[PDB]
Enzyme design. Structure first.
Site, PDB file in Angstrom:
ATOM      1  N   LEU A  16     -38.789  19.078 102.091  1.00  0.00           N
ATOM      2  CA  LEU A  16     -37.910  18.289 103.107  1.00  0.00           C
ATOM      3  C   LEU A  16     -37.976  16.733 102.645  1.00  0.00           C
ATOM      4  CD1 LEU A  16     -37.098  20.640 104.664  1.00  0.00           C
ATOM      5  CD2 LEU A  16     -36.601  19.282 106.495  1.00  0.00           C
ATOM      6  N   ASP A  17     -37.148  15.943 102.609  1.00  0.00           N
ATOM      7  CA  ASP A  17     -37.241  14.423 102.427  1.00  0.00           C
ATOM      8  C   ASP A  17     -38.193  13.708 103.579  1.00  0.00           C
ATOM      9  OD1 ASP A  17     -37.010  11.859 101.501  1.00  0.00           O
ATOM     10  OD2 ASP A  17     -34.843  11.500 102.369  1.00  0.00           O
ATOM     11  N   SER A  18     -38.798  12.676 103.225  1.00  0.00           N
ATOM     12  CA  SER A  18     -39.520  11.953 103.993  1.00  0.00           C
ATOM     13  C   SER A  18     -38.620  11.562 105.167  1.00  0.00           C
ATOM     14  CB  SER A  18     -40.193  10.949 103.461  1.00  0.00           C
ATOM     15  OG  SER A  18     -41.317  11.032 102.622  1.00  0.00           O
TER      16      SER A  18
END
Ligand SMILES: CCCCCCCCCCCCCCCCCC(=O)OC[C@H](COP(=O)([O-])OCC(O)COP(=O)([O-])OC[C@@H](COC(=O)CCCCCCCCCCCCCCCCC)OC(=O)CCCCCCCCCCCCCCCCC)OC(=O)CCCCCCCCCCCCCCCCC
Ligand SMILES: CCCCCCCCCCCCCCCCCC(=O)OC[C@H](COP(=O)([O-])OCC(O)COP(=O)([O-])OC[C@@H](COC(=O)CCCCCCCCCCCCCCCCC)OC(=O)CCCCCCCCCCCCCCCCC)OC(=O)CCCCCCCCCCCCCCCCC
Ligand SMILES: CCCCCCCCCCCCCCCCCC(=O)OC[C@H](COP(=O)(O)OCCN)OC(=O)CCCCCCCCCCCCCCCCC
Ligand SMILES: CCCCCCCCCCCCCCCCCC(=O)OC[C@H](COP(=O)(O)OCCN)OC(=O)CCCCCCCCCCCCCCCCC
Ligand SMILES: CCCCCCCCCCCCCCCCCC(=O)OC[C@H](COP(=O)(O)OCCN)OC(=O)CCCCCCCCCCCCCCCCC
Ligand SMILES: CCCCCCCCCCC[C@H](O)CC(=O)SCCNC(=O)CCNC(=O)[C@H](O)C(C)(C)COP(=O)(O)O
Lengths: 166, 94, 75, 120, 84, 178, 71, 458, 110, 158, 65
Positions: free
Chosen positions: E39-41
């Protein structure tokens, strides 16, 4: 009609009764929230008796209970007026107080110091009613400053929070 | 992200906090200790009355009233007089 | 899961009152018994006219009996 | 908050009467004969019924009645209802009395202005 | 009721199973959001925020730039509200 | 509150900490939920674009104009949770968090009751004094070789040693004393 | 405490769906919409109208009035 | 009045002759009873004041104090049993005797007919006080504080000595009774305008006026608790008692020679009250509170209206009791904390539940809560000041608002807020500490029931 | 005194029943979840807004029409009346946000 | 003075640059951050002139040694920390600029005060003439002198 | 005592609903009962006179001139 005078003096004595019970060791043994809630309940009924009287015929009673100082020309004495403003308000205030103390028992349940909280609420009522029924203004001042200080004690109930202190 | 070591400090210190809170738990027995309505409505009352009918009442100007708001045509008990009635205004028209 | 509730030691702020509320109540009640029983049985005096040459003593001019006991015996 | 304010503040003036000094023309500016108002209650009746000075109006007499039926009939506070209508009515009949006096003073001042242009 | 860990544990697991990006049949505690769930930051900001709204308190910034295992969230939340 | 503050902030943590203030200050404007969840996935878009800008200068010029756009488009009364700063319930139950070194001045009568409680308390105090030496030494043997020191403290690194300067992160007054 | 199956929640049938469709028009996927579903999912699903609250109990209140008026 | 005095002297033999272990209880127990004999003077069933004998008299103004002076010796000896319990058994018996001599001297000064008897005894009280402050003072600066306390009083004192010898030649006796029933009317010359200043200035100095009050903050800071109690409760009021008995003569000049002081005091009341608002040392704040609440008194002993004087007598006795109470509780925090700083020690109610109730009642006495003699006092001075000039309410009105703020701030930052993390753990409260307080407030509650006794001569 | 006391304890009920949420923003649909307080809240709200034949109505409109009939500041007369409409507005704000809206409270409900 | 040497306590205005760097050690500051309060002889001395920001905006989450002063142990205390404490003055950025605030608030105040004046100029009064009290405007009962009768004030019908 | 519920409509007790409908219904019975018995909320019961229909004789407006 002593029934009238005695009633006006009696409400104060009945409400002061919770205050000194906490002064003595007795409150640990009985339940302070339930006991205080009942006595305000009885105070409201006692307040009703003068209220009906005033309705019968409009009579205003000035009651000079105790003398405090002669102070030469300006004698100072403790006087409770029983004019329409005072007894009408006395009944309305205690009904609201009787409502709140029952609410207080539910709301502050789990507070480690419920008894102190109920204690200050009635002290507030005693100062508030003194402010209501005050003939000489020195007593009006006792009530005016008195609710101010207990509000200070009760707004900041949770002293830890600086927001409450501010 | 969690520095490898930082997640071993929080790993370990959380483990100790869990034990402290367990220890905080009280053992059974932990706390080792070693109509009335009339009571405070009637008993206070007698006193007050004693005070109001035998001090206040007795002393001068301690319990003063207003008048009884007599109306036209109503009798005065103490003197016996009967207040004269008003005139017969016939305005009606309500 | 009753949990232990840390609290400031509360004996020193309670041992005090059992001692202050006690030694006031020690000598306080015998007084209150004294003021009440005197005021009940003996009673304040009623005012009267100096009877043509009584020249009443210092104690005679005060109402409450124990308030004229001190006056007669000590002042 | 009527239109009377509009007429006076906005637009015209010197016509709409001044709230103060409403009774400003002779009691008879063409009023042929006018019996002074009548007060039913005796100055004493009121003083014995302890009517607040303000409440000592020309309706003081119907008030005393209400108050009578309110002390009598005590436990029942909902039964002196006819007496209240009466007092109120008496109060209206004088509320309109005041309304009529104000309108009369308005119109009369207009008379002056109308008469003014007859002048020159 | 007070929050037992094995519950808080399930609650944090649950919410994620409702985030569309995070597979519902793989999210497994100890499945790092970023290097596993991928998952993206930017997402992790939200994943935390959901938790802050499921449990009703704020995970401070500095202490929440690291709530990446889906478990750290389960002990940090519990350590915060004193759940033994 | 737990982990230590970094010295300077990176570009990322500044951007990614706006995504929080921003989205959370968008849920004061969008009191409802469907409106919000809508107006917010549109926010990410704003951050989603300009994600791969490699031109730092530019990136720090989108950030500097984002936080001014935000300052002027923020809600005066946002939704800050209770138990969080400023909002209520923050220091409410702190009047009842006594600091635990106070049960040491209790009268032998008071501590007479609550007996097993103090039996476990005396164990933990033995743990604390039994390691202060190995701890401080650890804290020191592992000291920095440079003046660069961060407030981060080391883990245990050996069996039996208690992860250091721990007596007050453990033994903390419980949050809700009630 | 058991917890409702995560699957139960779905966006269709709730106001989130219309937000979902316009977001889809822009091409955004509205990822956390499923979490915000139980708000509109059931029990709390019915729309609440302002007259309904002000008029709560009016039906019996008037029923009570008529009867009393009769007697 | 030699029972309030001779039995007192005999205390000194008892502090010395008694066993080292039993010295404290013999002295404290006996002076409690010495206070009980003092209560006999209150039996005034007539206006004629009580002239016990040629040199010793007690009138309504002195009687309320002689009892307070006798009352505090017990308390002073109970508040200093802790510090001064680390001494060599001959340093104690000196401190106990020093405290004993203060009230022997102070009882006589307040109960003295001849004004120069007042002066000799008046300025003697400095010897016992300077020893208490300098010898046992904790801080490095008490040598300095002692110097300030000796010189400010001494430079004021020699002018009064010249003035009183001067009136004795002008009138022929310094006997307060006669001086009152004799015609001494100054003649508004330039010289008399100096006499008046000579007599009042020495009294105005120990009653800190705004211009010369720097001695009191410095003195109470390093003074031991017993010395700070004596300075605030009895020592400062020596100046007020003097101004009441000395202005019987110099009757005409104070009508117009007072403006300077009155304005100095009322503006002084505001600034002294305000600097309390941000002062880090608690003992410092109580001391400036003492300056401001004493600045009100010099502004009532100068307006000279019956109520002023009555307000002054009420406030002096009341503020005396309240200030000590504040100085006594400040010490209890100082001994466990080991620092005078107000910012440290936050949250004590959490750990010392009752002392906080005493703190709250002391603060409410400090500010004017109404069913208290403290308020009656200010209400009266306020009234007369208003009579002097309706504008006075503005300045006596900024002081009331400020007085509320600093009084509650002492409670808010010392006895509320989160607890200090881990100062040396604060041992629980001793029963002595709490009684020393109870002994201060229980009399404050009892006096408020019947204010007539402390009502002044007017 | 009667109605304001009611509304505050009404919110006391909502705040205590919810996890101490004191913000209208996270509180919703109390009408179905807690009819007893919602019923009390609207009774109080209408009394605050001077609903006809309720305690506010007997005293409040006497005051309103008193203004409309006396000689008074025009600015005072206009502000007092819109103040009355504002009392209805914020009264409306409370019931719409607190009671008649989809719930927005934290997910566990107790 | 338990463990406090004069050189570990404050001193005089750092005149030479070595003294400015010596003081910065005493106060546990960085030598390039010690900016002595201006030398105008009002007493500040060498005490650092720390940013005038209140403890209100000190990060409210960090574990400040002294929690309530939001101040750590050793960090130079601000000269006026008796005023900038959380319980007193705030200097915390505000969403609206300060000027904008001062102008707006007072504008409101003024407009109101003014409008109230427009009001007193143009009051609202119903079309009603004056109320009429009986007798002589209740001369005697308003407490008038019984002996001296007043000029009769009569009120006529319609 | 009741049971915590997760993402579901809290179950309601008989009494909670009945008391709530009770207080509200009495509010409406009272408003309706008083409206019928005392409808002076509108018009009071005294009609405003039209101040502009008062014959000039009524007010004493002399015949101009
Ligand atoms: C008109 C009259 C004036 C009306 C207006 C008065 C001003 C406005 C009110 C100001 C109140 C100030 C205040 O906050 O005080 C609360 C304070 C209690 O606060 P708290 O936080 O509960 O105390 C916690 C402590 O841990 C202590 O609590 P605890 O946990 O130990 O609980 C045991 C209990 C145990 O209580 C005791 O202290 C027992 C003391 C017994 C002394 C007498 C023994 C018998 C003597 C026989 C002879 O302790 C207390 O709760 C009370 C503490 C009292 C401290 C010392 C009080 C000395 C006497 C005060 C008298 C006040 C005037 C008369 C009333 O003390 C009072 O209750 C004062 C009541 C004052 C009533 C004034 C008159 C009311 C209207 C008439
Ligand atoms: C069925 C039951 C029916 C019961 C009927 C009554 C039975 C009965 O007891 O007979 C009455 C009979 C006395 O009545 P009596 O014989 O008909 O006539 C009494 C004398 O006229 C007078 O005798 P006395 O005056 O010598 O004795 C009573 C006196 C005794 O005095 C003492 O006890 C001295 C103190 C002793 C302390 C001991 C420790 O008590 C007082 O004077 C109380 C004074 C006021 C105390 C409360 C504070 C009021 C002021 C509050 C301050 C704030 C004011 C603000 C004002 C603001 C205005 C703007 O027995 C007593 O009640 C004696 C009471 C003694 C009380 C002592 C404890 C007081 C505390
Ligand atoms: C406020 C603080 C409490 C105020 C108490 C006022 C009454 C004090 C008092 O003096 O009561 C005892 C009184 C003493 O007698 P005395 O005053 O001389 O009256 C003689 C009349 N010929 O009278 C007696 O001794 C006779 C015995 C009386 C015993 C019962 C007294 C009950 C009095 C209740 C009065 C309550 C007044 C309202 C209190 C409000 C408190 C806020
Ligand atoms: C320095 C501190 C002292 C400054 C001046 C203090 C006040 C004056 C001296 C002390 C008070 C005093 O008694 O002065 C009055 C004296 C004249 O005395 P008086 O009673 O007016 O005699 C008039 C006879 N036709 O007039 C004087 O004594 C004048 C004294 C002048 C010298 C004062 C002391 C200077 C010390 C250096
Ligand atoms: C003497 C000069 C100064 C000396 C200071 C140090 C002295 C210490 C050693 C002596 C101590 C005892 C002597 C001083 C106290 C005297 C008490 C007293 O005189 O009580 C008198 C009172 C009778 O009342 P009386 O005034 O005679 O009647 C008025 C008629 N017009 O009799 C009574 O009513 C007794 C009642 C006892 C309990 C009364 C409690 C009442 C509390 C009322 C106020 C409550 C709120 C106070 C708020 C304060 C805030 C700080
Ligand atoms: C409700 C209040 C409304 C306020 C809304 C606000 O004003 C409008 C707004 O936020 S305008 C957003 C534009 N903000 C950027 O464009 C920063 C981009 N920053 C980068 O691209 C970085 O260089 C990096 C590559 C590290 C990103 O990587 P990362 O995934 O974030 O870690």
């Amino acid at each position: 009609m002593n029934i009238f005078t005695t009633s006006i003096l009696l409400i104060f004595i009945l409400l002061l009764s919770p205050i000194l019970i906490s002064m003595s060791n007795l409150i640990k043994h009985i339940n302070f929230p339930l006991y205080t809630t009942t006595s305000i309940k009885f105070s409201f009924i006692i307040s009703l008796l003068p209220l009906l009287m005033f309705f019968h015929n409009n009579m205003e009673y000035m009651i000079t209970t105790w003398h405090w100082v002669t102070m030469n020309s300006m004698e100072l004495k403790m006087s409770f007026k029983t004019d329409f403003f005072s007894i009408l308000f006395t009944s309305v205030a205690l009904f609201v107080t009787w409502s709140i103390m029952q609410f207080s028992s539910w709301y502050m349940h789990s507070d480690p110091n419920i008894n102190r909280f109920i204690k200050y609420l009635t002290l507030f009522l005693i100062t508030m009613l003194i402010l209501t029924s005050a003939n000489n203004m020195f007593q009006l001042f006792i009530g005016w400053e008195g609710v101010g200080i207990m509000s200070f004690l009760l707004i900041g109930w949770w002293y830890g929070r600086t927001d409450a202190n501010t | 992200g969690y520095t490898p070591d930082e997640k071993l400090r929080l790993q370990q210190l959380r483990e100790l906090r869990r034990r402290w809170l367990k220890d905080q738990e009280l053992s059974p027995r932990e706390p080792v200790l070693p109509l009335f309505a009339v009571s405070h409505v009637l008993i206070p009352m007698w006193f007050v009355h004693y005070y109001v009918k035998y001090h206040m009442a007795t002393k001068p100007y301690t319990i003063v009233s207003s008048k009884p708001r007599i109306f036209p045509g109503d009798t005065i008990l103490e003197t016996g007089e009967v207040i004269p009635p008003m005139r017969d205004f016939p305005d009606q028209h309500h | 899961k009753r949990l232990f509730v840390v609290k400031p030691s509360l004996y020193y702020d309670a041992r005090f009152l059992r001692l202050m509320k006690f030694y006031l109540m020690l000598t306080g009640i015998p007084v209150i018994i004294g003021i009440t029983l005197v005021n009940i049985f003996i009673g304040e005096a009623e005012l009267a006219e100096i009877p043509e040459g009584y020249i009443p003593e210092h104690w005679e001019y005060y109402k409450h009996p124990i308030s004229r006991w001190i006056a007669r015996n000590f002042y | 908050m009527g239109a009377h304010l509009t007429r006076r503040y906005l637009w015209d003036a010197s016509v709409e009467p001044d709230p103060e000094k409403i009774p400003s023309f002779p009691p008879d500016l063409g009023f042929p004969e006018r019996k002074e108002r009548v007060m039913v209650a005796t100055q004493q009746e009121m003083m014995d019924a302890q009517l607040t000075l303000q409440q000592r109006d020309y309706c003081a007499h119907y008030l005393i009645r209400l108050l009578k039926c309110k002390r009598d009939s005590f436990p029942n506070f909902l039964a002196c209802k006819h007496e209240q209508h009466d007092w109120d009515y008496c109060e209206h009949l004088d509320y309109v009395k005041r309304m009529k006096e104000f309108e009369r003073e308005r119109r009369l001042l207009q008379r002056k202005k109308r008469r003014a242009l007859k002048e020159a | 009721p007070p929050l037992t860990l094995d519950g808080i544990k399930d609650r944090v697991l649950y919410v994620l199973k409702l985030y569309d990006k995070i597979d519902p049949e793989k999210l497994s505690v100890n499945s790092h959001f970023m290097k596993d769930l991928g998952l993206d930051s930017l997402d992790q900001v939200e994943i935390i925020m959901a938790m802050e709204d499921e449990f009703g308190f704020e995970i401070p910034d500095i202490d929440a730039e690291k709530l990446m295992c889906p478990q750290e969230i389960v002990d940090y939340i519990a350590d915060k509200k004193d759940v033994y | 509150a737990f982990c230590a503050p970094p010295a300077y902030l990176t570009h990322q943590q500044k951007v990614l900490r706006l995504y929080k203030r921003a989205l959370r200050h968008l849920e004061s404007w969008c009191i409802h939920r469907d409106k919000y969840r809508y107006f917010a996935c549109l926010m990410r878009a704003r951050f989603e674009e300009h994600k791969n800008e490699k031109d730092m200068m530019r990136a720090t010029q989108l950030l500097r104009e984002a936080e001014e756009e935000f300052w002027q488009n923020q809600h005066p009364q946002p939704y800050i949770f209770p138990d969080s700063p400023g909002g209520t319930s923050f220091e409410r139950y702190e009047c009842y968090k006594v600091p635990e070194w106070c049960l040491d001045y209790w009268h032998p009568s008071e501590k007479a009751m609550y007996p097993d409680y103090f039996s476990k308390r005396e164990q933990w105090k033995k743990l604390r004094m039994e390691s202060w030496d190995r701890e401080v030494k650890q804290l020191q043997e592992e000291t920095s070789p440079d003046g660069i020191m961060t407030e981060a403290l080391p883990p245990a690194r050996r069996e039996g040693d208690l992860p250091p300067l721990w007596w007050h992160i453990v033994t903390r007054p419980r949050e809700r004393p009630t | 405490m058991e917890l409702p199956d995560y699957r139960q929640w779905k966006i269709e049938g709730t106001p989130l769906e219309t937000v979902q469709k316009k977001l889809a028009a822009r091409g955004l996927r509205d990822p956390w919409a499923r979490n915000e579903a139980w708000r509109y999912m059931g029990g709390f699903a019915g729309n609440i109208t302002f007259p309904s609250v002000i008029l709560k109990g009016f039906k019996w209140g008037f029923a009570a009035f008529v009867v009393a008026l009769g007697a | 009045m030699l029972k309030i005095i001779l039995p007192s002297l005999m205390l000194l033999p008892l502090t010395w002759l008694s066993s080292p272990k039993k010295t404290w209880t013999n002295v404290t127990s006996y002076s409690f009873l010495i206070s009980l004999t003092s209560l006999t003077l209150l039996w005034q069933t007539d206006e004629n004041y009580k002239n016990f004998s040629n040199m010793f008299s007690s009138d309504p103004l002195s009687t309320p104090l002689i009892i307070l002076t006798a009352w505090l010796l017990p308390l002073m000896l109970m508040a200093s049993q802790n510090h001064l319990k680390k001494d060599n058994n001959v340093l104690q018996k000196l401190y106990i005797s020093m405290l004993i001599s203060l009230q022997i001297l102070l009882i006589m000064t307040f109960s003295a007919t001849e004004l120069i008897m007042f002066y000799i005894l008046f300025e003697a009280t400095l010897i016992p006080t300077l020893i208490i402050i300098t010898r046992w003072g904790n801080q490095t600066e008490r040598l300095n504080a002692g110097i300030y306390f000796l010189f400010y009083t001494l430079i004021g004192s020699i002018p009064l000595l010249i003035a009183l010898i001067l009136i004795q030649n002008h009138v022929g006796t310094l006997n307060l009774m006669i001086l009152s029933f004799t015609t001494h009317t100054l003649d508004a010359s330039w010289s008399n305008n100096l006499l008046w200043l000579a007599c009042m200035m020495a009294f105005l100095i120990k009653m800190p006026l705004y211009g010369v009050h720097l001695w009191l903050p410095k003195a109470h800071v390093e003074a031991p608790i017993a010395g700070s109690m004596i300075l605030a409760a009895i020592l400062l009021k020596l100046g007020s008692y003097g101004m009441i008995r000395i202005s019987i003569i110099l009757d005409p000049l104070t009508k117009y020679m007072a403006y300077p002081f009155i304005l100095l005091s009322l503006w002084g009341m505001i600034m002294t009250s305000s600097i309390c608002l941000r002062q880090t040392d608690l003992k410092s704040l109580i001391a400036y509170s003492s300056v401001s609440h004493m600045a009100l008194v010099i502004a009532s002993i100068m307006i000279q209206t019956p109520w002023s004087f009555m307000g002054a007598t009420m406030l002096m006795i009341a503020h005396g009791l309240t200030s000590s109470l504040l100085f006594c509780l400040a010490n209890s925090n100082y001994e466990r904390i080991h620092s005078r700083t107000m910012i440290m020690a936050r949250g004590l109610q959490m750990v010392f539940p009752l002392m906080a109730t005493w703190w709250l009642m002391a603060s409410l006495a400090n500010l004017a809560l109404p069913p208290s003699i403290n308020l009656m006092g200010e209400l009266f001075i306020t009234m007369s000041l208003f009579s002097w000039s309706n504008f006075t309410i503005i300045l006596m009105g900024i002081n009331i608002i400020i007085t509320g703020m600093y009084s509650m701030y002492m409670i808010i930052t010392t006895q509320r807020g989160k607890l200090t993390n881990h100062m040396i753990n604060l041992q629980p409260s001793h029963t002595r500490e709490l009684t020393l307080m109870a002994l201060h407030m229980i009399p404050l509650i009892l006096l408020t029931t019947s204010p007539k006794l402390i009502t002044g001569l007017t | 005194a009667f109605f304001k006391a009611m509304l505050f304890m009404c919110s006391g009920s909502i705040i205590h029943s919810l996890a101490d949420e004191q913000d209208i923003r996270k509180m919703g649909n109390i009408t179905k979840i807690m009819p007893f307080t919602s019923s009390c809240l609207v009774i109080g709200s209408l009394a605050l807004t001077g609903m006809p034949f309720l305690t506010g109505f007997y005293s409040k409109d006497l005051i309103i029409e008193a203004i409309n009939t006396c000689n008074t500041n025009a600015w005072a007369l206009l502000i007092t009346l819109i103040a009355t409409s504002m009392t209805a507005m914020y009264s409306m704000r409370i019931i719409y946000f607190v009671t008649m809206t989809k719930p927005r409270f934290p997910p566990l409900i107790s | 003075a338990f463990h406090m040497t004069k050189d570990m306590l404050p001193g005089s205005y750092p005149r030479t640059p070595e003294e400015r760097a010596a003081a910065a050690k005493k106060y546990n500051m960085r030598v390039e951050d010690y900016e002595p309060y201006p030398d105008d002889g009002m007493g500040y001395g060498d005490y650092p002139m720390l940013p005038n920001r209140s403890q209100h905006e000190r990060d409210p989450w960090y574990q400040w040694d002294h929690s309530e002063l939001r101040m750590n142990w050793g960090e130079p205390i601000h000269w006026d920390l008796d005023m900038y404490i959380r319980n007193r003055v705030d200097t915390s950025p505000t969403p609206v600029s300060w000027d904008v605030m001062c102008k707006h608030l007072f504008g409101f105040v003024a407009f109101m005060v003014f409008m109230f004046w427009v009001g007193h100029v143009f009051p609202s009064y119903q079309p009603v003439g004056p109320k009429q009290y009986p007798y002589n405007n209740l001369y005697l009962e308003r407490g008038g002198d019984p002996t001296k009768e007043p000029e009769p004030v009569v009120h006529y019908d319609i | 005592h009741i049971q915590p519920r997760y993402r579901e409509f809290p179950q309601l007790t008989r009494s909670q609903v009945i008391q709530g409908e009770f207080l509200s219904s009495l509010m409406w019975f009272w408003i309706l009962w008083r409206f019928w018995h005392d409808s002076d909320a509108v018009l009071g019961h005294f009609s405003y006179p039209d101040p502009s229909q008062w014959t000039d004789e009524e007010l004493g407006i002399p015949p101009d001139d």
